[PDB]
Amino acid sequence: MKFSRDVTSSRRKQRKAHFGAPSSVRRVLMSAPLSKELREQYKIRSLPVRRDDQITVIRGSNKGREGKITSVYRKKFLLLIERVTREKANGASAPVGIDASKVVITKLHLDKDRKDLIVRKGGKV
Amino acid sequence: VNIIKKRTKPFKRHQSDRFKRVGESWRKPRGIDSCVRRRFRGTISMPKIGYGNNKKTRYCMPNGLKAFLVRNVSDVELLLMHNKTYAAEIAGNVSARKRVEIVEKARALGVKVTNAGAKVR
Amino acid sequence: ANPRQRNKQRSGKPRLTRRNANKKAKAKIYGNFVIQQNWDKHATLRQNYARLGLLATPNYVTGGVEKLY
Amino acid sequence: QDEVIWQVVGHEFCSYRIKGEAQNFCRNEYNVTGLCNRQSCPLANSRYATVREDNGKLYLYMKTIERAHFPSKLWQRIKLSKNYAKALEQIDQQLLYWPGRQIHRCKQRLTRLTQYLLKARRLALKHQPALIPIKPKQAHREASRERKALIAAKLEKNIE
Amino acid sequence: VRYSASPALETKCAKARGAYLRTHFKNSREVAFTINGMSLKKAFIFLDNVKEHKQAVPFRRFNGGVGRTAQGKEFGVTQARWPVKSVKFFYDLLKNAEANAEAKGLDMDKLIIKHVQVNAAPKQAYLSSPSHIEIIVAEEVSRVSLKQGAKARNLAARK
Amino acid sequence: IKNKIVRQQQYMKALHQKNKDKLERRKERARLSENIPATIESKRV
Amino acid sequence: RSKPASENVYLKLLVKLYRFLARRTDSRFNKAILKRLFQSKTNRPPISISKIAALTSRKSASSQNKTTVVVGTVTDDERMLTVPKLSIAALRFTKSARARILKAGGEVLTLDQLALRAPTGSNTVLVRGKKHA
Amino acid sequence: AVSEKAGHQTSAESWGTGRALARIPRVGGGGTHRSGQAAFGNMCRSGRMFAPTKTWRKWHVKVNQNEKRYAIASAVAASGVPSLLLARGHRIEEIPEVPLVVDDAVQSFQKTKEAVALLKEIKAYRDVIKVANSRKLRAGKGKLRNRRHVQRRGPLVVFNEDTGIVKAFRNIPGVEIVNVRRLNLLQLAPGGHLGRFVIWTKSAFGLLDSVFGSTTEVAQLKKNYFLPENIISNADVTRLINSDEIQSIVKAAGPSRVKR
RNA sequence: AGCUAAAUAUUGGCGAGAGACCGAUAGCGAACAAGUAGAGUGAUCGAAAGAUGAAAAGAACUUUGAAAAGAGAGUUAAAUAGUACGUGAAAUUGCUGAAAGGGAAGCAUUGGAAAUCAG
RNA sequence: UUUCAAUGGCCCGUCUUGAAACACGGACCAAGGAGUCUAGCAUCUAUGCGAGUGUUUGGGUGAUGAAAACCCAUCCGCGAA
RNA sequence: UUGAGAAGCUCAGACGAGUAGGCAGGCGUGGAGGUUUGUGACGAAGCCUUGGGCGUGAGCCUGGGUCGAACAGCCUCUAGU
RNA sequence: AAAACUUUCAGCAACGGAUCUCUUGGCUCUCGCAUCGAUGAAGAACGCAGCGAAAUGCGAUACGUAAUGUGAAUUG
């Protein structure tokens, strides 16, 4: 149970805060688990998703597909992964968005900031 | 002691046929001039305690058993000793899987089921 | 519901949210260092004064006092 | 003790009573007759006996005042033999000097329980059609599929 | 869209409909009632005659204010009118229903108007009465008792 | 549009704009060998 | 009336006992106790320990070991300093009345204890409180 | 309560008599669909409710401190009766003893696994399993109002000193931990129903005499308080009726249900 | 002639946490373009209006039509979800089926016939 | 269930009067829609205590929701003349 | 003889219009605490139905259809019932 | 006396938008804090985006500039 008067348990407030979140806040909201191998290598359970990360879809009709993230659609909380598309009637392909929590990061797009972020969260690189 | 019914027709509310806004559920006429309230000639009947049925056969189905609403198998086992007195009636919101478990267990206990064939076939 | 509250409901500028309210949090001791080192933040000031050997008030208490034992 | 307990459970509230149209039923695991009352409530009656199922073996459960304070050891259990006559003899010798009303309820339960075991074995031997469930989502979908399948089949032109 | 009638299956039938049509519902109902059950080509001739005033549409249900004409004697009534806008809509729908049947591969010569119905569209104080119209054109144990059977056996043996 | 009357009005303007432009190209155009109606049977695996 | 308006389970148990005694014995005492059990609080005025003491040792006295019985509360009387030895059966004893009777005197009984000691109510003084309010 | 101005913010008066209109006030002006519409009435749309709720409704109820202490004493005594716990709905069928008292090492627990392990050892974990399996979504508008989930009640842990017992037990679903000095009726008779399963520590049990006292000695922790006395000495009326003293004086019992 | 903290008040201001409250004719007039559209010379007055789907995958393509649309087709778990979009009551309307009908009708009682249920 | 036959069956509410009839309301359906909250007094019943009785102005206290629960110093109210 | 939900069981007799008024017991709805090892995408709620059943009645249960996310019995609490 | 018409019942389709579920809203309570303006406020008007009408933001540096934080978007 929550014991802090600074956090609200109200459903109305929590749903307003979730769907009213700015992009900097949705960046945290769109987090994915690190794979077992990455977890034992970096000592980090989960990370925010970033473009060009290598992920595997874990849930849904696309369970098992893998690919890089071609776009994080923060305004809809969606990940557009390459080759995970849908064929429209006319023959064009509409990419299918996957929630960040339904994928798992198999390889990270490491930068100086990501390494700094990793060691910041009690991690090792 | 056969099941005897003092009446089979329901008691429809006065003028409920003429008007759709007037439901068929019985309502006591309060008008001090209501001819049916005064029980005039040819008027429809009104519910009376004399219409009540024999206490021995009251609440009993034509087969002679009383209906007992059952939601899961546990309620079925509750009717182990009253299978000659009570018939299991499976609830409408009980899913198909639990119905087959209820019906099969009722068959073992020798308990009649009023709607055994529903959502089970 | 006010015009001034409807003004920022439909606005894009975020509310000036401050997080300061945590009840049951008693004021921490500044002032005396010896009292601060021996003050347990959970207890009440009457419990703390009595444990330390001090009188919270030199006058009668206006109510029943706790009897734990 | 017992009288006050009955006044609390039998007339305020009990989590074993299914209020019925003309009778209440005791969901208690020990009510011999199945309907709760002063003569049937295990809660209200300290000295109680019952007959119940256990993996094909009927068992006699008994409790008394001397064990009422210890729920773990309150009930005691013995096996009833397959033979009906010997089973009644065991019940009589176990419930000796117990009220004849209490023994009568136990023997009534044992008779019913024996009928239950006989019918269960008979239905186990006998073959019956298995009753499958019905899926509303499947039924609605397959219906729409067949309406579209028939409209696209063109049976008359194909036969002609 | 699902229609009111059991037919319009692929077997022998075709469909056509028009919704929110800016015509009078009362006149459309009279036209639909008149042309119902006719052969498709015969209905086209009748509709053309109505445009030319060689035939009339009987106003059976909605007959308030309709003058008497001798052209209604064919349908056994005296009150008949010549709604032109409603005939235009029904002519168009019959053209469309014919085209749908042609694409399907039906036999045009045996086509009858199996089902034609008019419904009120949402009202659109001069709230008009638009009409929904849909047209479907289609090609045209007991036992015996002991005494009963024994008598039957005795009777059969005597024969 | 979270306003139901407005989202309906924009859709009707969108529908008219789409239908008008679809037949603007249709009348300009007026093929059968390539463009054929695809069916479930043609899409069978 | 034939049942008490009180929903107290222990009072209902007392009524259950005295229903049996009234119809299975010939004691007008048991019939009286049952009727007074059905009475409301207003019609069961409290009786003082002083009035019990007065009535027992009244006129010819002759109280001996006869038990005083009241269907109601027995209140204390701080006015009298000396308390006689008494045996009273009552619905309720106030904490002061019970202490004074026990410490300096005899016994306090519940109405079920009386039913075991005097099931027919023999050698009992069935007293009542003043209903003048 | 509702707004004290809701239903009044419009301007409207009755159009009068003799105009073939119900004489309810109607909204003045024109050019909007509200114009001419009725207002100021329980029967009217966008009108005032009948007797608008007020915040000075009586919410809190006084109870004499003696009756509250009576009910809390009655709640504890009911907790010591095994049959009332079963009717309450507690899975105490394998509890070694009622009242269940554990040693004082429990008050110094630190981990939820230590508290769960103890519950299993005394076989009180069946009541926890019942609570976890009972968690359902609330039916009705309650879940729109921060009342999202419902569940049964587990055991009540009563301690004397808090050296980690409260935090060790507090995440176990259904378990409520309370100081023996401030026993709560809302937790001792939840729903108004007697007989909650209580687990006492040794120190909490040993101080119960100071908290409540006896029927003849004052409570140490409640000044001038004595445990209430009973209307009856013996609660087994059936034994009293069938006792030797009464069965030896009652006249011969007439027949039970007689023949017609 | 003069000043003065604290305990006290607070339908506003900047925030926060709650509720045995209301649930779209309710709750603020306003859950959505709400003091908006609109009305009045003006002071003022002042609404109606929430819900496709998990995803727009929002129906390519062919055909008819001047077009709007229709019909095959397609997407979908589902179009008994096609934006006139969750569920879809009644009033009311059209259609088909069955039956009744010589200046009212509804209803009650008893049965017959036809249809349909327990069986 | 529909329908037929025989038999019976005056339109509901409101108001007026000894009583009717007038007269007023009623095109139809859905949703809404009227003895409520509070202060005082009185009766009766229940509950607690009882020559007493009333914790909640306030204080203490409450780590797990702390607006709860729990505790009560001095007064005061009513009663006991 | 098992027939002690003592608030239960059983036997017997008489009686049955009813305005004002008085008294009693029940049905239903929103929400709250408790409980039912409660129901539910293998279909909750709702709706529809010349399906069935129960109650003198208020009402309740159920089959079939439609439907797509929650709801109910029991004991008490509460009311914008 | 068949049809039409009228009515009744059932089915289907309309019309309508009740019901049910929901809910970034309202309402009520409690708690913390004290901050408009001649250094031009509140309010009004007009403007500003690659493609914008409202609402939002902003003011010719015009859906923003600097600075700091985050660390890779925006999205029709």
From Swiss-Prot, chain A:
Gene Ontology annotations of biological process type: cytoplasmic translation; ribosomal large subunit biogenesis
Swiss-Prot/TrEMBL keywords: Cytoplasm, Nucleus, Ribonucleoprotein, Ribosomal protein
Highest taxon listed in the record's lineage: Eukaryota
Localization per Swiss-Prot or TrEMBL: Cytoplasm; Nucleus; Nucleus, Nucleolus
InterPro entries linked: KOW (IPR005824), Rib_uL2_dom2 (IPR014722), Ribosomal_uL24_CS (IPR005825), Ribosomal_uL24_euk/arc (IPR005756), Ribosomal_uL24_KOW (IPR041988), Translation_prot_SH3-like_sf (IPR008991)
Location of region: Disordered: 1-23
GO terms of molecular function: RNA binding; structural constituent of ribosome
Gene3D superfamilies reported for this sequence: 2.30.30.30
Primary subcellular site in the record, as a coarse category: cytoplasm
GO cellular component, one term: cytosol
Assembly description: Component of the large ribosomal subunit (LSU). Mature yeast ribosomes consist of a small (40S) and a large (60S) subunit. The 40S small subunit contains 1 molecule of ribosomal RNA (18S rRNA) and at least 33 different proteins. The large 60S subunit contains 3 rRNA molecules (25S, 5.8S and 5S rRNA) and at least 46 different proteins.
PANTHER family found in the cross-reference section: 60S RIBOSOMAL PROTEIN L26 FAMILY MEMBER
Family statement drawn from the similarity comment of this UniProt entry: Belongs to the universal ribosomal protein uL24 family.
The protein's name: Large ribosomal subunit protein uL24
Lineage: Eukaryota, Fungi, Dikarya, Ascomycota, Taphrinomycotina
Swiss-Prot record, chain C:
Region (Disordered): 1-23
Subcellular location: Nucleus, Nucleolus
Subunit structure: Component of the pre-66S ribosomal particle.
Function comment: Involved in the biogenesis of the 60S ribosomal subunit.
UniProt similarity note: Belongs to the NOP16 family.
Full protein name: Nucleolar protein 16
Organism the protein comes from: Schizosaccharomyces pombe (strain 972 / ATCC 24843) (Fission yeast)
Lineage of the organism: Eukaryota, Fungi, Dikarya, Ascomycota, Taphrinomycotina
Swiss-Prot record, chain E:
One annotated Gene Ontology cellular component of this protein: preribosome
Compartments where located: Cytoplasm
Main location: cytoplasm
Record InterPro entries: Ribosomal_uL22, Ribosomal_uL22_CS, Ribosomal_uL22_euk/arc, Ribosomal_uL22_sf
Superkingdom classification of source: Eukaryota
KW Membrane (keyword) present: no
One annotated GO biological process: cytoplasmic translation
Coiled coil: none
SUPFAM superfamilies for the chain: Ribosomal protein L22
Alphabetical list of Gene3D superfamilies matching this protein: Ribosomal protein L22/L17 (3.90.470.10)
UniProt function note: Component of the ribosome, a large ribonucleoprotein complex responsible for the synthesis of proteins in the cell. The small ribosomal subunit (SSU) binds messenger RNAs (mRNAs) and translates the encoded message by selecting cognate aminoacyl-transfer RNA (tRNA) molecules. The large subunit (LSU) contains the ribosomal catalytic site termed the peptidyl transferase center (PTC), which catalyzes the formation of peptide bonds, thereby polymerizing the amino acids delivered by tRNAs into a polypeptide chain.
Note: There are 2 genes for uL22 in S.pombe.
Subunit structure, interactors included: Component of the large ribosomal subunit (LSU). Mature yeast ribosomes consist of a small (40S) and a large (60S) subunit. The 40S small subunit contains 1 molecule of ribosomal RNA (18S rRNA) and at least 33 different proteins. The large 60S subunit contains 3 rRNA molecules (25S, 5.8S and 5S rRNA) and at least 46 different proteins. uL22 is associated with the polypeptide exit tunnel.
The protein's name: Large ribosomal subunit protein uL22A
Native source species: Schizosaccharomyces pombe (strain 972 / ATCC 24843) (Fission yeast)
Curated annotation (Swiss-Prot), chain H:
Cell compartments where the protein resides: Cytoplasm
Entry GO MF terms: RNA binding; structural constituent of ribosome
Keyword Aminoacyl-tRNA synthetase: no
Sorted UniProt keywords: Cytoplasm, Ribonucleoprotein, Ribosomal protein
Broad class of the protein's primary localization: cytoplasm
Gene Ontology biological process terms in this record: cytoplasmic translation
GO cellular component, one term: preribosome
Membrane-spanning residues: none
Domain of life: Eukaryota
Protein family according to the UniProt entry: Belongs to the universal ribosomal protein uL4 family.
Additional free-text comment from the UniProt record: There are 2 genes for uL4 in S.pombe.
Function: Component of the ribosome, a large ribonucleoprotein complex responsible for the synthesis of proteins in the cell. The small ribosomal subunit (SSU) binds messenger RNAs (mRNAs) and translates the encoded message by selecting cognate aminoacyl-transfer RNA (tRNA) molecules. The large subunit (LSU) contains the ribosomal catalytic site termed the peptidyl transferase center (PTC), which catalyzes the formation of peptide bonds, thereby polymerizing the amino acids delivered by tRNAs into a polypeptide chain.
Subunit annotation: Component of the large ribosomal subunit (LSU). Mature yeast ribosomes consist of a small (40S) and a large (60S) subunit. The 40S small subunit contains 1 molecule of ribosomal RNA (18S rRNA) and at least 33 different proteins. The large 60S subunit contains 3 rRNA molecules (25S, 5.8S and 5S rRNA) and at least 46 different proteins. uL4 is associated with the polypeptide exit tunnel. uL4 interacts with its chaperone ACL4 and the nuclear import receptor KAP104.
Gene it is expressed from: rpl401
